Ligand binder design. Structure first.
Ligand SMILES: OC[C@H]1O[C@@H](O)[C@H](O)[C@@H](O)[C@H]1O
Ligand SMILES: OC[C@H]1O[C@@H](O)[C@H](O)[C@@H](O)[C@H]1O
Ligand SMILES: OC[C@H]1O[C@@H](O)[C@H](O)[C@@H](O)[C@H]1O
Ligand SMILES: [Mg+2]
Ligand SMILES: [Mg+2]
Ligand SMILES: [Mg+2]
Ligand SMILES: [Mg+2]
Ligand SMILES: [Mg+2]
Ligand code: NA
Ligand code: NA
Ligand code: NA
Ligand code: NA
Lengths: 1011, 204, 193
């Protein structure tokens, strides 16, 4: 009687969902949130055996352990144990789309556990087992006898084992099916795994117990008073001597407390709930909760007798906060929020989708450290501990039901079918009943990518009836449907409309003012951070700050979903789509994070931190104006740190303490700054510093910064002409310039500098040539594949145009002698099938001081896709340990993603000039560089550059960063101009026009020499 | 057209309708009715059932019908006749001028009800003028009011025919029987006969 | 595996609800709303036997007609046939309030019907059966083999019999339970049949 193929059966004998319980038998333990004797963990070593289908599971297993089984750790994903491969598919379902049927060959994981139960647990009360997460459906047996069934991989399933357990040894048999009808609602773009991946527990409750409690906090207009309302429901024998006492604790203090017997108010003609009671406590001047200041209280619910005997007690942290959308704005405690959020999948590079406290806290610290204040549980309820952490550390959470069917056609084929209303209903209602008490949860989401069906509207209204305290949102069907309180598009651009039929993505600014529209707009996903991305990120924030109703969004996404594999030698490397024999697979589309699977920041994370600062600065002569973007806190743990520097050389500095009220401003008068003398550019740089360490930050943590170009002094005193003069030698094949020790050679057959010498030492391994292409970035490739080509993607437009295989034809190559320098003039014409794509005219001027002045002037056909770049490149022979440059840094920065970078003198090891993106591509570029120093070399001008041991060619031919091999020497890419990286989304041209090399005619000048 | 859902026996009346565990069962009794009869022009209003308090399930299903079929108003008297689950104030047995201030679910004078602060909906009693036996007294008062008040748009008398069953005595003669007359117990006396006509359609 | 005591299971293999169909194969017949050859009525004389609970229903019944059975007219309410008494209760449930459980002693009505199907109906298309009203829940078998389950006494339950029917004689076995978890939603002030 196949239950995994019937959307009408989502469980069998499963107990009701509810807030986190622990059944303390001591109120003091409850208040202090200390471990509970009535809550045992069944985590550890279990017995596991894999099978090709449930029909292959031998009966013996139900009562007797299979010897063929192995001992494995639980929770875990059997794919991670190597029992079968984890699949990575984006939209296209991993199985054949034929609801509600699943493959006959359904990987079945057989988990078993022998453990014993204290005799005292069976002498009284209720003993139940709790599975926080089983992917994707499963049957449970206790001591050979069958208990129940459950579906929905992201919420806990609980069963009453009281009548199955015996004192002493007991055995659990858990048959977990990888696929099930529930899989139709679990089509998220992530690795497709299975098994018991979340904690297993054993909870003992009294017979007469607390079965549920709801905490609510309502305030007066100025939040000076608040009423805490606690609705409590019980089970078991009802008796008058029964009582419930809800007490509110602020630390060791008891702010309020109320006691009352069961018996609710009259609700209808039949009376009221005799098995419930509501307590209402008053609270004067409550400490409000926010991501800024996570002020919490402790609510302790006690079930006892009138004579004072405790029966059992439950509790939870309470955060006094009011969330409401009013007059088009999302208000948190009366103030309009600006969501600096990010989407976060529960992913571990080694543990699969199994979460642990440590990984969680880590992520949370990183997030807050990079100025994030909100997170979206994309796309399913998260592990229970997570909400607890966000509560205490301070993070606005979007709790999202486990429902995605993006693979269906049309997308709402299931969500609009009343036959599936039941399955969906439970994934929404059970989430609410579980997490509704967490203050960090400020918004409820109905799921992800599932079109817009009636079911969504029905469930939308349910939440609104059940819990008025939180707004509901859903992006399906166009982001502004009748099923959402917030216009929550995903990847809708700032100024550009994407008029798709039925579900267009309007410019977020245009969206707010559409006729009739009045809701607040917060993108549920934006700034696809896939690889070298996040370009144009600053534009979003510029807009968020200017438009009251543009209240932020959630970046996509937090961490790369890469898994660790090992080569023959036993070395670890990051793997993605297909790397497990999984097929069909979606390449590297599972890696869209701001950090690598091991939580190592990507360059882009830094840009995010900067744009999401909570302190804005403006400069007016001598005064720096600091404006606070906080809504509640005062800048009581910050001090401004300034410093003036002439092209890297510091001159003055100081530090003023910050005393800014939320929303307020503070003026800082810098002392008569040092009057520069030497030629150069003076740069004022301010940094906000947190002197004291917090719960999430180290001491001296930097929360914000900003630069300003002070005065400038154009150098007029041109160089003192040296008396030496370069000598020009002429072959029929070469032009050789010699000066003292240095030797220059221009191959008259190419028109390029083929070699240089500093003594009997060669300097180049590859001629110094022009370059107009780049190792395609993920954003340049989009969804274009080997067999399926997307002619629109930048990479394809370039390929087709012939940029990647252009033959450089020589038009001219002459040499002349001047009063004090040799002058080589070149001129090339890159073409493809006749079409002249680029023309590069240059003039090299080597003078007495031994400096080579390269002047380039390029032309680009006004009918050939704009080049990825316009510069020069060559393979240097040396391999130095450091790289020093005066320009934007220290981290990788590109035209459309360089706001965070600062202008100064930077020095780093050659390796840090290379960004280890799992999928290799153009990287490590640094813009606005006036001086570059590598080995004996020094390049001067106003260029961009990237320097590493990998050629653009290798990079574009290599698929994984671990297959990259260092090459002889160091590859230098010096660009006069570089196209933006884009990133508004990674599946369609997303580079803003102002960042496209389209000028037609470009000009840059370089000065090569020996330092 | 009214869905097959009444749980007046529960305590409180909405113990099931407000329990998400029962959302599925209810859902099907509403949706399948709509999918079946939605094409009939005589159907002008959809009802979510009868005497079942007011639970979240009612609100969920209310919104569903509104999404699926905008052509018809939805109504439900449970929970006080003016809940968020009804487009029409549809009380049952609310009197013309006299208020019956029951706690939680009062029955205001239909005339006073229309003008309650904020209220703006039309009022049509889903049941009024219990025609049990020698009844229907004061019936003229309801109509006097219906005609005078624009928003007092009528109601539905309770009810059409007596639910009496035919039994036979020793001689084999037929007679009308009611509660208990079949050994049924517990039974509710003659409360199954509230019609304007006898079981055999003879007018009262 | 008691389905009548689980509000999570309200049907098994039942087809989707929909407006009244007749499957006319002639547009003129459709326009004039005249009878349809593709819509046969199974009303008439059926075989019926009453039982104190489903657990008392002899397996033989699934494949072979009980001789102890009687021939009765369908549709109808077995209370009206005198097989047991019709109950009249207003508000107070007719059974003990303990959702989703019903009495162990659940009056079970066993209806059966032997009828034949034209060979042309089995050579193509879909052949389904439609029960406009079964109070209050029931299991259906066609030729000994099990078809499905259904609840909700006031709306039709439809099942696809295409793969159960054979040309010529066929037999339907319908086990109707008087009480079921669905009875919790059917507490109207009327005779309980
Ligand atoms: O990077 C692709 C993304 O597209 C979004 O629409 C979806 O909600 C995400 O879960 C992910 O699939
Ligand atoms: O989620 C929105 C989009 O995400 C992309 O990754 C995918 O290739 C598109 O087909 C669409 O699903
Ligand atoms: O016969 C008395 C009537 O009382 C009404 O409240 C109920 O809705 C009717 O179904 C009937 O029970
Ligand atoms: Mg199932
Ligand atoms: Mg997806
Ligand atoms: Mg900026
Ligand atoms: Mg059932
Ligand atoms: Mg009634
Ligand atoms: Na704003
Ligand atoms: Na993705
Ligand atoms: Na300070
Ligand atoms: Na009646």
């Amino acid at each position: 009687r196949r239950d995994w193929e019937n959307p009408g059966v989502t469980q069998l004998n499963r107990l009701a969902a509810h807030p986190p319980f622990a059944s303390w038998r001591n109120s003091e333990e409850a208040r202090t949130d200390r471990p509970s004797q009535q809550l045992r963990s069944l985590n550890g070593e279990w017995r596991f055996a894999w099978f090709p289908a449930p029909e292959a599971v031998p009966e013996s297993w139900l009562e007797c352990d299979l010897p063929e089984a192995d001992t494995v750790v639980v929770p875990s994903n059997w794919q991670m144990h190597g029992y079968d491969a984890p699949i990575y598919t984006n939209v296209t379902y991993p199985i054949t789309v034929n609801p509600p049927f699943v493959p006959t060959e359904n990987p079945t994981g057989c988990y078993s556990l022998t453990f014993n139960v204290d005799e005292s647990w069976l002498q009284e009360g209720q003993t139940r087992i709790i599975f926080d997460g089983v992917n994707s459906a499963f049957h449970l047996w206790c001591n050979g006898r069958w208990v129940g069934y459950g579906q929905d991989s992201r919420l806990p399933s609980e069963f009453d084992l009281s009548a199955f357990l015996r004192a002493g040894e007991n055995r659990l048999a858990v048959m977990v099916l990888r696929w099930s009808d529930g899989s139709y609602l679990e089509d998220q773009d992530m690795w497709r795994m299975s098994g018991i991946f979340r904690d297993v527990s054993l909870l003992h409750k009294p017979t007469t117990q607390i079965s549920d409690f709801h905490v609510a906090t309502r305030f007066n207009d100025d939040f000076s008073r608040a009423v805490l309302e606690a609705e409590v429901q019980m089970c078991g024998e009802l008796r008058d001597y029964l009582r419930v006492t809800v007490s509110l604790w602020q630390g060791e203090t008891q702010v309020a407390s109320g006691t009352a017997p069961f018996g609710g108010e009259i609700i209808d003609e039949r009376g009221g709930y005799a098995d419930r009671v509501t307590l209402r406590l008053n609270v004067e001047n409550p400490k409000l909760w926010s991501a800024e200041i996570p002020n919490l209280y402790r609510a302790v619910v006690e079930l006892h007798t009138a004579d004072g005997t405790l029966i059992e007690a439950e509790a939870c942290d309470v955060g006094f906060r009011e969330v409401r959308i009013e007059n088009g704005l999302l208000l948190l405690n009366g103030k309009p929020l600006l969501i600096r959020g990010v989407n976060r999948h529960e992913h571990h590079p080694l543990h699969g989708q199994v979460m642990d406290e440590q990984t969680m806290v880590q992520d949370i610290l990183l997030m807050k450290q990079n100025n994030f204040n909100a997170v979206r549980c994309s796309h399913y309820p998260n592990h229970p501990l997570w909400y607890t952490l966000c509560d205490r550390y301070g993070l606005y959470v979007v709790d999202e039901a486990n429902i995605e069917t993006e693979g269906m056609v049309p997308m709402n084929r299931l969500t609009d079918d009343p036959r599936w209303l039941p399955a969906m209903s439970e994934r929404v209602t059970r989430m609410v009943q579980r997490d509704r008490n967490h203050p960090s949860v400020i918004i409820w989401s109905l799921g992800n990518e599932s079109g817009h069906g009636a079911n969504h509207d029905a469930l939308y209204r349910w939440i609104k009836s059940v819990d008025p305290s939180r707004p509901v949102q859903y992006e399906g069907g166009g982001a502004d449907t009748t099923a959402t309180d917030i216009i929550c598009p995903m990847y809708a651009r700032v100024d550009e409309d994407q008029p798709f039929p039925a579900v267009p993505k309007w410019s977020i600014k245009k969206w707010l003012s559409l006729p009739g529209e009045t809701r607040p707009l917060i993108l549920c996903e934006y700034a696809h951070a896939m690889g070298n991305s996040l370009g144009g990120f600053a534009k979003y924030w510029q807009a968020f700050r200017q438009y009251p109703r543009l209240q932020g969004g959630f970046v996509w996404d937090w961490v790369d979903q890469s898994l660790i594999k090992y080569d023959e030698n036993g070395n670890p490397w990051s793997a993605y789509g297909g790397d497990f024999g999984d097929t069909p697979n979606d390449r590297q589309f599972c890696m869209n994070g701001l950090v690598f699977a091991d939580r190592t920041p990507h360059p882009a994370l830094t840009e995010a931190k900067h744009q999401q600062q909570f302190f804005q600065f403006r400069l007016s002569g001598q005064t720096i104006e600091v404006t606070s973007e906080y809504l509640f806190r005062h800048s009581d743990n910050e001090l401004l740190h300034w410093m003036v520097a002439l092209d890297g050389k510091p001159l003055a500095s100081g530090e003023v303490p910050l005393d800014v009220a939320p929303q307020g401003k503070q003026l800082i008068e810098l002392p008569e700054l040092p009057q520069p003398e030497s030629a150069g550019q003076l740069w004022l740089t301010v940094r906000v510093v947190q002197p004291n360490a917090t719960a999430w930050s180290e001491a001296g943590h930097i929360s914000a910064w900003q630069q300003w170009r002070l005065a400038e002094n154009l150098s007029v005193t041109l160089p003192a002409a040296s008396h030496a003069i370069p000598h020009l030698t002429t072959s029929e094949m070469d032009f050789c310039i010699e000066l003292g020790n240095k030797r220059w050679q221009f191959n008259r057959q190419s028109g390029f500098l083929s070699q240089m010498w500093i003594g009997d030492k060669k300097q180049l391994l590859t001629p110094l040539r022009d370059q107009f292409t780049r190792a395609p970035l993920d954003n340049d490739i989009g969804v274009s594949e080997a067999t399926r080509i997307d002619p629109n993607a930048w990479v394809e437009r370039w390929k087709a145009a012939g940029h990647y295989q252009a033959e450089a034809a020589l038009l001219q190559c002459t040499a002349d002698t001047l009063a004090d320098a040799v002058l080589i003039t070149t001129a090339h014409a890159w073409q493809h099938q006749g079409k002249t794509l680029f023309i590069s005219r240059k003039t090299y001027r080597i003078d007495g001081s031994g400096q080579m002045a390269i002047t380039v002037d390029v032309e680009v056909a006004s009918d050939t896709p704009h080049p990825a770049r316009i510069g020069l490149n060559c393979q240097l022979a040396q391999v130095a340990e450091r790289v020093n440059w005066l320009g934007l840094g220290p981290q990788e920065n590109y035209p459309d993603r360089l706001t965070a970078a600062c202008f100064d003198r930077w020095d780093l090891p050659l390796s840090d000039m290379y960004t280890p993106y799992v999928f290799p591509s153009e990287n490590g570029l640094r813009c606005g560089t006036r001086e570059l120093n590598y080995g004996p070399h020094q390049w001067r001008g106003d260029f961009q550059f990237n320097i590493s041991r990998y050629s653009q060619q290798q990079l574009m031919e290599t698929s994984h960063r671990h297959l990259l091999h260092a090459e002889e020497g160091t590859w230098l890419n010096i660009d006069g101009f570089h196209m933006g990286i884009g990133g508004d989304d990674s599946w369609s041209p997303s580079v803003s026009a102002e960042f496209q090399l389209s000028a037609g005619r470009y000009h840059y000048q370089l000065v090569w020499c020996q330092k």
